[PDB]
Amino acid sequence: PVVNRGQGWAYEPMSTRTVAAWIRQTGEKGLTSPETITYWGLISQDLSSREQVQLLEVVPGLQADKDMLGAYLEERAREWDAQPQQPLPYTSAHIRGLTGDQAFAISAQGREAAQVFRAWITQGLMNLAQLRA
C-alpha cells in the first residue's frame, strides 16, 4: 500500500497474509458478491494501481467474471483516453497500473489515479452482480 505514517508518503509491500486472505475471500464468496465487493472496497483503499492489478490477477478461477471485468476496465480506459483535455493528468495506463513506477505511485497524481481505478473496479463488480440478480 501507499501510506503516510508522519514521515511522508511511502510504499510498503503488501504482506503475503493480505494477498492470501483476498484469494480466500474470492474462493469462498466469489468476485461479485456483496461480501467480496465490500471486502474489495476496504482492502483497496490505500493500494497503488499496480497493487490493484496484482490482486485481480491472483484471483483463482472465476474466468468469466475476470474477462467481463477486464472488458469493462478496457472500455473505461478507452473512454478516459478519449476525453478532450490536453494534457490529461495521467493516462488510462497509469490508472490501470500498466505504467508508472514507485515514485509515481507515491505521487499525488498516482494516489488520485489509484482512487479512480479503485472506483472503476468497484463499479464494474457491482455492474456484474446486477446482470445476475
CB atoms within 10 A of CB 60: 10
CB atoms within 10 A of CB 63: 9
Residue with the three cell numbers 503516510: 4
CB atoms within 10 A of CB 106: 17
**Overall domain count for the chain:** 1
CATH of the domain at 105: 1.10.375.10
Give the cell for residue 6: 508522519
Residues near 81 by Cβ (< 8 Å), separated by ≥ 6?
A: 88, 91, 92
Helix (H) or strand (E) holding 3: strand 2-4
Torsion over CA: 48, 50, 51, 57 (sign): positive
Give the domain extent around 48. Answer: 1-133
Of 133, 113, 112, which Cα lies nearest the Cα of 32? Answer: 133
